[PDB]
Amino acid sequence: IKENSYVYVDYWDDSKAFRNIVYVRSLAANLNSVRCTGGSYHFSLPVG
């Protein structure tokens, strides 16, 4: 994941805002940024 790429996050709730959401206009939002740090993954070789 680098600058040229993108991350999509689709979202849905059980509230009234999504009850019959099939047409939408004037769509906008404000999301504060976030950070994602990758953890460690051990490649289990047979020997070594």
Binding site: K16, A17, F43, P46
Partner: protein
């Protein structure tokens, strides 16, 4: 104006037109597919999303 307001902007006999503004919490999680190659077991074929 409320944080979770339910505002109207046009109403008709069958249809209406609601304006919805909501405060939300987007909790998501990355996905990965580790596919390790065959062979002796020292090779991995793909580490994808």
């Amino acid at each position: 104006a409320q944080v979770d307001e339910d505002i109207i902007v046009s109403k008709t006999s069958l249809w209406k037109e609601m304006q919805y503004n909501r405060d939300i919490i987007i909790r998501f999680k990355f996905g990965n597919s580790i596919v390790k190659m065959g062979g002796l077991g020292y090779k991995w074929s793909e580490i994808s999303y």
